[PDB]
Amino acid sequence: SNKFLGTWKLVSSENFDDYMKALGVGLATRKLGNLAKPTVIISKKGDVITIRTESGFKNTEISFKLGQEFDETTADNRKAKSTVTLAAGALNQVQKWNGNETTIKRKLVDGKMVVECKMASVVCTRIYEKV
Ligand SMILES: CCCCCCCCCCCC[N+](C)(C)[O-]
């Protein structure tokens, strides 16, 4: 949805270390991931949505159509397959690798994007402010 377009800067994080832990990210990569303060730029060209994530330590970018699975190499270097869908103020991603699955749900809240990330029992919340 065009609702999500813009540039969003991280202003808060809760439980990200434990989230990366649960995904099997190693200590040394985790230390960088916890110092990152990323910017997420969401753009759209026709029906192809691009989410670019920029930081001092790693940049990533995915382009996709809603509801169509796509291959992805993640920031921590998992070779994954993901699908993004749209439901009423939320863009929801399921990301799979091996027999494993994690969810990343981006929800809009008055000028902010609240992102809930879940891997088994671990819940992480990252808040971005439109800028
Ligand atoms: C050669 C560069 C290696 C250093 C990469 C540092 C970035 C680690 C960020 C981990 C992010 C975890 N993830 C994908 C779930 O968001």
UniProtKB/Swiss-Prot annotation:
SUPFAM superfamilies: Lipocalins. It comes from the Eukaryota. GO terms for biological process: fatty acid transport. GO terms for cellular component: cytosol; nucleus. Keywords: Acetylation, Cytoplasm, Disulfide bond, Lipid-binding, Transport. (9Z)-octadecenoate binds at residues 106, 126-128. Disulfide bonds join 117-124. InterPro entries: Calycin, Fatty_acid-bd, ILBP, Lipocln_cytosolic_FA-bd_dom. Detected in spinal cord (at protein level). PANTHER family: FATTY ACID BINDING PROTEIN. Monomer. P2 protein and myelin basic protein together constitute a major fraction of peripheral nervous system myelin protein. This is Myelin P2 protein. The lineage of its organism: Eukaryota, Metazoa, Chordata, Craniata, Vertebrata.
